[PDB]
mmCIF file with all atom_site columns, C-alpha atoms in Angstrom:
data_model
loop_
_atom_site.group_PDB
_atom_site.id
_atom_site.type_symbol
_atom_site.label_atom_id
_atom_site.label_alt_id
_atom_site.label_comp_id
_atom_site.label_asym_id
_atom_site.label_entity_id
_atom_site.label_seq_id
_atom_site.pdbx_PDB_ins_code
_atom_site.Cartn_x
_atom_site.Cartn_y
_atom_site.Cartn_z
_atom_site.occupancy
_atom_site.B_iso_or_equiv
_atom_site.pdbx_formal_charge
_atom_site.auth_seq_id
_atom_site.auth_comp_id
_atom_site.auth_asym_id
_atom_site.auth_atom_id
_atom_site.pdbx_PDB_model_num
ATOM 1  C CA . UNK A 1 1  ? 66.028 118.679 103.284 1.00 0.00 ? 1  UNK A CA 1
ATOM 2  C CA . UNK A 1 2  ? 68.113 115.515 103.629 1.00 0.00 ? 2  UNK A CA 1
ATOM 3  C CA . UNK A 1 3  ? 68.295 113.118 106.581 1.00 0.00 ? 3  UNK A CA 1
ATOM 4  C CA . UNK A 1 4  ? 71.212 113.391 109.011 1.00 0.00 ? 4  UNK A CA 1
ATOM 5  C CA . UNK A 1 5  ? 72.451 110.584 111.269 1.00 0.00 ? 5  UNK A CA 1
ATOM 6  C CA . UNK A 1 6  ? 75.440 110.039 113.563 1.00 0.00 ? 6  UNK A CA 1
ATOM 7  C CA . UNK A 1 7  ? 77.749 107.016 113.522 1.00 0.00 ? 7  UNK A CA 1
ATOM 8  C CA . UNK A 1 8  ? 79.835 106.067 116.587 1.00 0.00 ? 8  UNK A CA 1
ATOM 9  C CA . UNK A 1 9  ? 83.087 104.210 116.025 1.00 0.00 ? 9  UNK A CA 1
ATOM 10 C CA . UNK A 1 10 ? 84.999 102.644 118.887 1.00 0.00 ? 10 UNK A CA 1
ATOM 11 C CA . UNK A 1 11 ? 88.794 102.577 118.895 1.00 0.00 ? 11 UNK A CA 1
ATOM 12 C CA . UNK A 1 12 ? 88.905 98.934  119.934 1.00 0.00 ? 12 UNK A CA 1
ATOM 13 C CA . UNK A 1 13 ? 91.834 96.561  119.166 1.00 0.00 ? 13 UNK A CA 1
ATOM 14 C CA . UNK A 1 14 ? 91.114 96.926  115.444 1.00 0.00 ? 14 UNK A CA 1
ATOM 15 C CA . UNK A 1 15 ? 90.909 100.728 115.556 1.00 0.00 ? 15 UNK A CA 1
ATOM 16 C CA . UNK A 1 16 ? 88.070 102.443 113.724 1.00 0.00 ? 16 UNK A CA 1
ATOM 17 C CA . UNK A 1 17 ? 86.653 99.064  112.735 1.00 0.00 ? 17 UNK A CA 1
ATOM 18 C CA . UNK A 1 18 ? 86.173 99.801  109.036 1.00 0.00 ? 18 UNK A CA 1
ATOM 19 C CA . UNK A 1 19 ? 87.582 101.450 105.910 1.00 0.00 ? 19 UNK A CA 1
ATOM 20 C CA . UNK A 1 20 ? 87.074 104.706 104.025 1.00 0.00 ? 20 UNK A CA 1
ATOM 21 C CA . UNK A 1 21 ? 87.181 105.776 100.385 1.00 0.00 ? 21 UNK A CA 1
ATOM 22 C CA . UNK A 1 22 ? 88.482 109.096 99.106  1.00 0.00 ? 22 UNK A CA 1
ATOM 23 C CA . UNK A 1 23 ? 87.052 110.950 96.181  1.00 0.00 ? 23 UNK A CA 1
ATOM 24 C CA . UNK A 1 24 ? 89.831 113.550 95.975  1.00 0.00 ? 24 UNK A CA 1
ATOM 25 C CA . UNK A 1 25 ? 92.942 112.468 94.065  1.00 0.00 ? 25 UNK A CA 1
ATOM 26 C CA . UNK A 1 26 ? 92.382 108.778 94.695  1.00 0.00 ? 26 UNK A CA 1
ATOM 27 C CA . UNK A 1 27 ? 88.759 108.753 93.608  1.00 0.00 ? 27 UNK A CA 1
ATOM 28 C CA . UNK A 1 28 ? 87.102 105.581 94.834  1.00 0.00 ? 28 UNK A CA 1
ATOM 29 C CA . UNK A 1 29 ? 83.527 106.763 94.222  1.00 0.00 ? 29 UNK A CA 1
ATOM 30 C CA . UNK A 1 30 ? 82.468 107.052 90.521  1.00 0.00 ? 30 UNK A CA 1
ATOM 31 C CA . UNK A 1 31 ? 81.563 110.735 90.597  1.00 0.00 ? 31 UNK A CA 1
ATOM 32 C CA . UNK A 1 32 ? 82.284 112.125 94.054  1.00 0.00 ? 32 UNK A CA 1
ATOM 33 C CA . UNK A 1 33 ? 85.161 113.965 95.730  1.00 0.00 ? 33 UNK A CA 1
ATOM 34 C CA . UNK A 1 34 ? 83.927 113.149 99.242  1.00 0.00 ? 34 UNK A CA 1
ATOM 35 C CA . UNK A 1 35 ? 84.351 110.205 101.630 1.00 0.00 ? 35 UNK A CA 1
ATOM 36 C CA . UNK A 1 36 ? 82.494 106.905 101.355 1.00 0.00 ? 36 UNK A CA 1
ATOM 37 C CA . UNK A 1 37 ? 82.709 103.623 103.234 1.00 0.00 ? 37 UNK A CA 1
ATOM 38 C CA . UNK A 1 38 ? 84.404 100.683 101.489 1.00 0.00 ? 38 UNK A CA 1
ATOM 39 C CA . UNK A 1 39 ? 84.824 97.997  104.174 1.00 0.00 ? 39 UNK A CA 1
ATOM 40 C CA . UNK A 1 40 ? 83.357 97.185  107.588 1.00 0.00 ? 40 UNK A CA 1
ATOM 41 C CA . UNK A 1 41 ? 84.916 94.954  110.237 1.00 0.00 ? 41 UNK A CA 1
ATOM 42 C CA . UNK A 1 42 ? 82.498 92.201  111.325 1.00 0.00 ? 42 UNK A CA 1
ATOM 43 C CA . UNK A 1 43 ? 80.977 93.897  114.360 1.00 0.00 ? 43 UNK A CA 1
ATOM 44 C CA . UNK A 1 44 ? 84.398 95.302  115.173 1.00 0.00 ? 44 UNK A CA 1
ATOM 45 C CA . UNK A 1 45 ? 83.560 98.897  116.054 1.00 0.00 ? 45 UNK A CA 1
ATOM 46 C CA . UNK A 1 46 ? 82.161 100.875 113.136 1.00 0.00 ? 46 UNK A CA 1
ATOM 47 C CA . UNK A 1 47 ? 79.914 97.991  112.111 1.00 0.00 ? 47 UNK A CA 1
ATOM 48 C CA . UNK A 1 48 ? 78.660 97.070  115.583 1.00 0.00 ? 48 UNK A CA 1
ATOM 49 C CA . UNK A 1 49 ? 78.805 100.550 117.134 1.00 0.00 ? 49 UNK A CA 1
ATOM 50 C CA . UNK A 1 50 ? 78.312 102.640 114.010 1.00 0.00 ? 50 UNK A CA 1
ATOM 51 C CA . UNK A 1 51 ? 76.013 100.223 112.184 1.00 0.00 ? 51 UNK A CA 1
ATOM 52 C CA . UNK A 1 52 ? 77.440 101.604 108.942 1.00 0.00 ? 52 UNK A CA 1
ATOM 53 C CA . UNK A 1 53 ? 77.759 99.555  105.753 1.00 0.00 ? 53 UNK A CA 1
ATOM 54 C CA . UNK A 1 54 ? 79.487 99.971  102.391 1.00 0.00 ? 54 UNK A CA 1
ATOM 55 C CA . UNK A 1 55 ? 77.625 102.747 100.605 1.00 0.00 ? 55 UNK A CA 1
ATOM 56 C CA . UNK A 1 56 ? 77.340 105.423 103.298 1.00 0.00 ? 56 UNK A CA 1
ATOM 57 C CA . UNK A 1 57 ? 78.922 108.854 102.811 1.00 0.00 ? 57 UNK A CA 1
ATOM 58 C CA . UNK A 1 58 ? 80.753 110.630 105.633 1.00 0.00 ? 58 UNK A CA 1
ATOM 59 C CA . UNK A 1 59 ? 80.123 114.381 105.831 1.00 0.00 ? 59 UNK A CA 1
ATOM 60 C CA . UNK A 1 60 ? 82.248 114.936 109.002 1.00 0.00 ? 60 UNK A CA 1
ATOM 61 C CA . UNK A 1 61 ? 83.763 113.228 112.030 1.00 0.00 ? 61 UNK A CA 1
ATOM 62 C CA . UNK A 1 62 ? 83.357 114.638 115.551 1.00 0.00 ? 62 UNK A CA 1
ATOM 63 C CA . UNK A 1 63 ? 84.482 118.148 114.551 1.00 0.00 ? 63 UNK A CA 1
ATOM 64 C CA . UNK A 1 64 ? 86.732 117.353 111.561 1.00 0.00 ? 64 UNK A CA 1
ATOM 65 C CA . UNK A 1 65 ? 85.759 117.669 107.910 1.00 0.00 ? 65 UNK A CA 1
ATOM 66 C CA . UNK A 1 66 ? 87.106 114.665 106.011 1.00 0.00 ? 66 UNK A CA 1
ATOM 67 C CA . UNK A 1 67 ? 84.752 115.275 103.113 1.00 0.00 ? 67 UNK A CA 1
ATOM 68 C CA . UNK A 1 68 ? 86.853 117.636 101.004 1.00 0.00 ? 68 UNK A CA 1
ATOM 69 C CA . UNK A 1 69 ? 90.209 115.880 100.831 1.00 0.00 ? 69 UNK A CA 1
ATOM 70 C CA . UNK A 1 70 ? 91.799 112.688 99.480  1.00 0.00 ? 70 UNK A CA 1
ATOM 71 C CA . UNK A 1 71 ? 91.403 109.270 101.036 1.00 0.00 ? 71 UNK A CA 1
ATOM 72 C CA . UNK A 1 72 ? 94.787 109.673 102.793 1.00 0.00 ? 72 UNK A CA 1
ATOM 73 C CA . UNK A 1 73 ? 94.016 112.915 104.621 1.00 0.00 ? 73 UNK A CA 1
ATOM 74 C CA . UNK A 1 74 ? 90.613 111.482 105.497 1.00 0.00 ? 74 UNK A CA 1
ATOM 75 C CA . UNK A 1 75 ? 92.384 108.585 107.195 1.00 0.00 ? 75 UNK A CA 1
ATOM 76 C CA . UNK A 1 76 ? 94.247 111.145 109.269 1.00 0.00 ? 76 UNK A CA 1
ATOM 77 C CA . UNK A 1 77 ? 90.882 112.629 110.213 1.00 0.00 ? 77 UNK A CA 1
ATOM 78 C CA . UNK A 1 78 ? 89.748 109.280 111.619 1.00 0.00 ? 78 UNK A CA 1
ATOM 79 C CA . UNK A 1 79 ? 93.063 108.282 113.235 1.00 0.00 ? 79 UNK A CA 1
ATOM 80 C CA . UNK A 1 80 ? 93.348 111.705 114.844 1.00 0.00 ? 80 UNK A CA 1
ATOM 81 C CA . UNK A 1 81 ? 90.150 110.930 116.781 1.00 0.00 ? 81 UNK A CA 1
ATOM 82 C CA . UNK A 1 82 ? 89.995 109.042 120.103 1.00 0.00 ? 82 UNK A CA 1
ATOM 83 C CA . UNK A 1 83 ? 88.174 106.077 121.753 1.00 0.00 ? 83 UNK A CA 1
ATOM 84 C CA . UNK A 1 84 ? 84.675 106.734 120.427 1.00 0.00 ? 84 UNK A CA 1
ATOM 85 C CA . UNK A 1 85 ? 84.453 108.899 117.334 1.00 0.00 ? 85 UNK A CA 1
ATOM 86 C CA . UNK A 1 86 ? 81.107 109.962 115.881 1.00 0.00 ? 86 UNK A CA 1
ATOM 87 C CA . UNK A 1 87 ? 80.648 110.533 112.158 1.00 0.00 ? 87 UNK A CA 1
ATOM 88 C CA . UNK A 1 88 ? 77.952 112.573 110.442 1.00 0.00 ? 88 UNK A CA 1
ATOM 89 C CA . UNK A 1 89 ? 76.323 111.045 107.373 1.00 0.00 ? 89 UNK A CA 1
ATOM 90 C CA . UNK A 1 90 ? 73.319 112.064 105.273 1.00 0.00 ? 90 UNK A CA 1
ATOM 91 C CA . UNK A 1 91 ? 71.200 109.774 103.093 1.00 0.00 ? 91 UNK A CA 1
ATOM 92 C CA . UNK A 1 92 ? 69.923 111.181 99.737  1.00 0.00 ? 92 UNK A CA 1
ATOM 93 C CA . UNK A 1 93 ? 66.153 110.700 99.550  1.00 0.00 ? 93 UNK A CA 1
ATOM 94 C CA . UNK A 1 94 ? 64.639 110.836 96.062  1.00 0.00 ? 94 UNK A CA 1
ATOM 95 C CA . UNK A 1 95 ? 61.398 112.655 96.885  1.00 0.00 ? 95 UNK A CA 1
#
């Protein structure tokens, strides 16, 4: 049983307010074909609203699964969203 948390991102003037990494095709994570965060905008939207930092893994956004495709398609998953978009992330706890 892993922990599950939601991350809200506001579509402010900067957009999502962060960056994503794709494991499929354009593998950014050393050993993972999912999505991971790579950059956060200083309290832009994802950082301030989402409170997410480089190292978190996205397992879904709102109702879209951007955790089984390349970094590019994942971007489409985020951009396709609206004002506030919530992401679902789970932290791996070692016992």
